[PDB]
């Protein structure tokens, strides 16, 4: 019965005294400067320039000498500007969107002032005006003069729209009567559709020490079917001189340590992974005594990398609770799993950096005595489900307990030497026995592999252990005779021979645990195909698909490079395009193998060749593209998302998903999962709603973050039974129009291979469309007949821009991502251009959906003259596509009917038809 008065009064009363308070700060102060220390002989001068900030800078000083210490009088310096102009530019805008940019002009002047603001039109942006006047001597954008009062602030907007992809320069002129001031700003224009990355690796061993010689590889130029028009393909090439050379380059070549994946940082796991590259790099450097690579001082780099290491280790301390138990999320219920994982981290790091021994002991004790069963198996504490396992409910729970036990055995084994203890050794024997005698009834190669590694770090003389070893060796998968590649899968009922040749996070995990087991058991002749596979399965960033696979895979690679003695690196390398000319050639030695990653500029089939030399050279090429459709992909989730409106009142967004398990999977739901919602251009979301969906005991999601206009959530499990929905209000920041759809993606965290993607939007109707709305898209001539005469159509038809002129019939109309694809069958040919148009083939046409001028009717015959004939290559075939411009000709074709005007129309049309079919021009 309360109105909206008490409604907010209640939450205002309950905000306080239930909690004590929360730590946080609403202001930000950047890195301080002038921290230098100097020796002054009674006189010194240091000149420099101030930062751009409106700030009172208090510059104070201290000094000491053999006399003592002296406090210099604090000097006051305040940077201020009375007339200042702020400019708001969004992170990213997609071409074709009519977008107004708003900006705020502020004035501190005593009294009122009037101003003007000029927009600088850059050649790839229609201003809806094109105000630039080149008529007179000095060119300007004109202006709308606006006024502001004294010490006031006024808003000014400008409506624009991009054309070229990524046109980054726009100028703004602020003009008062006192004069002018210039503000340069950048505009990000991003391709439409969705980003997708294809990875092609190759390993180089010209000597064939490791079982094959490879001097060359060809990565072709493959255009995707759904690729967005007017968008070129991105190619990045990385050439490094060792199996781990790409990781080392990830640490050293880029000063800041880059996240190896695009996965979100929310979980404590992702914070733990941030120290992995620094650690393993340190391991290879110190153990093999390879520090000689630095031309600079080696020891300085030892202290720098050691410091990065310690900082990365203390990075995850925030998730540690009061009992030294580590929780998967901040303040959440601690999980035995993540605690064991962190115990493995600290257990390995304690070699080169001594951690707190007491804390380690307390953690081990907590997970050991806190959660363990009477048979030695381990029970998971929190509701966190690390992975989904094959088999029905008894098989899935049994397999899950097996996986958790093997995992915690791995962790405790790695860290045991820091705090050797009677009790933890006893429980180690318990869980080890459970693994030994319950693993042999094998179910999936995943669990068998992880148990094989856990038991591999323990006693290696057990006959049951060697039996598990013989079975996992029985499950191997090999490519080539003699063995070239070797890896593993999930083999339960999958014992049929199938290799889709698609890298799976789960697959890389299984084969990784197998490899580590081999490295500890030291069977070398068995290993080389596996490292041959993983070294070519790596990405440019040095990271693999997921976290769990990447950690163990990197440890395997590093230990391999540290066991078998690396060979001296001497190679003459060159990359060149097949038909096109040659690109940069790498002459690579032990000194510079870290050289720059080079992007492949030209579009051609790529070929890499090497002369005779020794060593192991990793060459990886990653390829970024955009495409318009998800219809080809493999969707693992029911997805539905839409936008409602409420009753001040706002707009609402709701997304929903459900898990679609495979036949081997059970109905228990999904594992740790992530929901990414791309926000359309110029509309934000309500922080308070998500913060409410997270921060309390009923939490529907464990963590939320907003990154670069993306709303990303994490959740323990996605139920297969019904739909789960996230719901939040949204805000319109500025007026947008003809906005392009955005992406809604859901995937499993530890195996992104299971994912589903979807396009979504707020809502769409027609705008009026007047000023520069249609950009060179389409024109359609009127129905029936006009003053248009067949010989004028002869002028336009044989026009050298026009390649082809023929009439066709409408077959199909498909709407794909703001772009219209018309299937049509040919009718009568007159003159064709460089492309061959066969009779009655099903061809395609493209249309920009924002154009209400030219539209097409279902199944009606039309006369078309196109200027351009476009081609695409599948490498086995070449398919043609016909663009539709505003310079292309479209005229309606009636069928045989006698309307009062029809006869003369068919007369003109046939007259032109036979005039041009005469090859007259």
């Amino acid at each position, epitope marked *: 019965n309360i109105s909206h008065k008490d409604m907010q009064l209640g939450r205002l009363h309950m905000k306080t005294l239930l909690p004590v308070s929360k730590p946080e700060i609403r202001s930000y102060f950047p890195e301080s400067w002038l921290w230098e220390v100097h020796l002054v002989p009674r006189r010194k001068q240091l000149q420099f320039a101030l930062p751009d900030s409106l700030t009172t800078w208090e510059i104070q000083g201290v000094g000491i000498s053999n006399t003592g210490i002296c406090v210099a009088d604090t000097v006051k310096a305040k940077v201020f500007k009375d007339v200042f102009l702020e400019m708001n530019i969004p992170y990213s805008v997609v071409r074709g969107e009519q977008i107004q940019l708003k900006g705020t002009v502020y004035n501190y002047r005593t009294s009122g002032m009037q101003f003007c603001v000029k927009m600088s039109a850059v050649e790839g942006i229609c201003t809806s005006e094109s105000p630039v006047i080149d008529h007179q001597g000095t060119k300007s954008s004109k*202006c709308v003069r606006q006024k502001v009062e004294g010490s006031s602030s006024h808003l000014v907007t400008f409506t624009v729209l991009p054309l070229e992809i990524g046109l980054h320069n726009i100028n703004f002129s602020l003009e008062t009567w006192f004069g002018k001031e210039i503000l340069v700003k950048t505009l990000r224009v991003v391709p439409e559709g969705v980003k997708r990355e294809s990875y092609s690796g190759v390993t180089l061993d010209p000597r064939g020490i490791y079982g094959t010689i490879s001097r060359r590889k060809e990565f072709p130029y493959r255009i995707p079917l759904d690729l967005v028009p007017k968008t070129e393909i991105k190619r990045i090439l990385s050439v490094k001189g060792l199996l781990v050379g790409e990781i080392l380059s990830a640490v050293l070549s880029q000063e800041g340590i880059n996240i190896l994946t695009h996965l979100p940082k929310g979980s404590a796991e992702a914070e733990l992974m941030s120290v992995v590259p620094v650690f393993y790099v340190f391991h290879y450097l110190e153990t093999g005594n390879h520090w000689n690579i630095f031309h600079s001082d080696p020891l300085i780099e030892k202290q720098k990398l050691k410091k990065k290491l310690k900082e990365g280790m203390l990075s995850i301390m925030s998730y540690r609770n009061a009992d030294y138990s580590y929780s998967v999320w901040k303040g959440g219920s601690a999980s035995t799993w993540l605690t064991a994982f962190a115990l493995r981290v600290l257990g390995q790091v304690n070699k080169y950096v001594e951690q707190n021994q007491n804390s380690i002991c307390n953690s081990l004790l907590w997970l050991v005595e806190n959660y363990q069963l009477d048979n030695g198996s381990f029970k998971e504490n929190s509701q966190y489900q690390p992975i989904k396992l094959q088999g029905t409910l008894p098989v899935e729970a049994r397999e899950n307990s097996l996986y958790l036990t093997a995992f915690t055995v791995i962790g405790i084994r790695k860290a045991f030497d820091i705090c050797p203890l009677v009790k933890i050794d006893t429980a180690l024997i318990k869980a080890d026995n459970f693994l030994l005698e319950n693993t042999l009834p094998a179910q999936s190669t995943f669990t068998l592999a992880i148990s094989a590694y856990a038991l591999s770090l323990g006693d290696k003389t057990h006959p049951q252990f060697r039996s598990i070893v013989s079975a996992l060796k029985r499950e191997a998968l090999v490519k080539g005779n003699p063995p070239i590649y070797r890896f593993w899968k999930d083999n339960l009922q999958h014992k049929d021979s199938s290799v889709p040749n698609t890298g799976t996070a789960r697959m890389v995990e299984t084969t990784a645990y197998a490899l580590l087991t081999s490295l500890n058991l030291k069977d070398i002749n068995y290993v080389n195909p596996v490292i041959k596979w993983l070294s070519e399965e790596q990405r440019y960033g040095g990271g693999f698909y997921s976290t769990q696979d990447t950690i163990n895979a990197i440890e395997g690679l590093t230990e391999y490079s540290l066991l078998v003695k690396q060979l001296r690196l001497s190679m003459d390398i060159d990359v060149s395009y097949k038909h096109k000319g040659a690109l940069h050639n790498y002459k690579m030695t032990d000194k510079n193998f870290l050289g720059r990653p080079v992007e492949v500029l030209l579009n051609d089939d790529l070929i890499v060749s090497t002369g005779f030399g020794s060593g192991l050279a990793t060459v990886h090429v990653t390829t970024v593209v955009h495409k318009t459709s998800t219809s080809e992909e493999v969707c693992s989730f029911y997805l539905k998302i839409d936008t409602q409106d409420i009753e001040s009142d706002y707009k609402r967004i709701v997304a929903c998903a459900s898990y679609k398990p495979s036949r081997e999977e059970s109905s228990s739901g999904s594992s740790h999962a992530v929901m990414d919602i791309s926000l359309p251009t110029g509309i934000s979301a309500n922080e308070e709603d998500l913060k409410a969906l997270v921060e309390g005991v009923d939490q529907l999601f464990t963590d939320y973050q907003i990154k670069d206009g993306h709303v990303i959530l994490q959740l323990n499990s996605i139920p297969s039974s019904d739909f789960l929905c996230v719901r939040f209000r949204i805000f319109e920041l500025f007026e947008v129009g003809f906005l392009s759809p955005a992406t809604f993606t859901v995937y499993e965290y530890h195996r992104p291979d299971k994912q589903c993607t979807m396009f979504y939007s707020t809502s769409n109707i027609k705008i009026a469309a007047c000023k520069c709305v249609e950009a060179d898209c389409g024109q359609m001539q009127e129905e029936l007949d006009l003053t248009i005469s067949a010989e004028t159509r002869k002028q336009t038809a044989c026009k050298p821009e026009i390649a082809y002129a023929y009439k066709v019939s409408i077959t199909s109309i498909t709407v794909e991502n703001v772009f219209v694809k018309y299937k049509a069958t040919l009718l009568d040919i007159y003159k064709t251009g460089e492309a061959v148009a066969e009779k009655d083939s099903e061809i395609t046409f493209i249309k920009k959906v924002t154009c209400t001028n030219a539209e097409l009717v279902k199944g009606r015959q039309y006369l078309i003259m196109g200027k351009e004939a476009l081609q695409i290559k599948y490498n086995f075939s070449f398919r043609y596509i016909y663009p539709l411009d505003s310079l292309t000709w479209i005229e309606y074709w009636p069928r045989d009917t006698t309307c009062s005007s029809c006869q003369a129309f068919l007369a003109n049309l046939d007259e032109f038809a036979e005039d041009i079919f005469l090859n007259g021009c």
Partner: antibody
Amino acid sequence: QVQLVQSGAEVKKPGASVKVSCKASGYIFSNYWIQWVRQAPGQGLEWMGEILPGSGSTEYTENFKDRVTMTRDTSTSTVYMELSSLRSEDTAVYYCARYFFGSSPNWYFDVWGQGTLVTVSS
Amino acid sequence: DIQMTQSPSSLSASVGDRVTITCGASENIYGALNWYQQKPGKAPKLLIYGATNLADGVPSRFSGSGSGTDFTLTISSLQPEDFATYYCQNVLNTPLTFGQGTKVEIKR
């Protein structure tokens, strides 16, 4: 080009609101402010107000505050003027002018209207 | 806020005389002043802007001096086109203002 059309002579009672309008032709209508000024006969002239066509932004003299109404029509490129509760001594010659804002410290009243003679009904 | 007064009300000028008309303001407008003339019953034409510069179609017979809070206008020789009423204005602060007018005494 530069063309500003002025309304015709109106005669209305002491306190009946009177309307006078100005038409804009030849230039871009909504990109330049329009100014209204009054000359009382035989003596100095007084600045009255300004309006932004298409933004509808208005400002007036505080002496004539709440005696004055300016409206804008982009269809016919016209601006309308209404004066309520005026009297016999207000009636005078009224003009429109275009403010030209230069890209330097050059600020003009550029094109002018023909003027409207407004008179009180007696 | 800011407003100015114009002086004098009138001055005697022969056909070949040399005369001056000035105005002055509340606050310093720097160079913000404009001068224009009005013939009886007609719209005024812009003559001087920025207190210095000459408009196009305006002869060089019209000179002016523009700095500070006080502004002056100088005519060395009068012409048959120079008999009218005159007005001065500031373009700077939000409330544009004007002057009180100047009458020309035609004959000596």
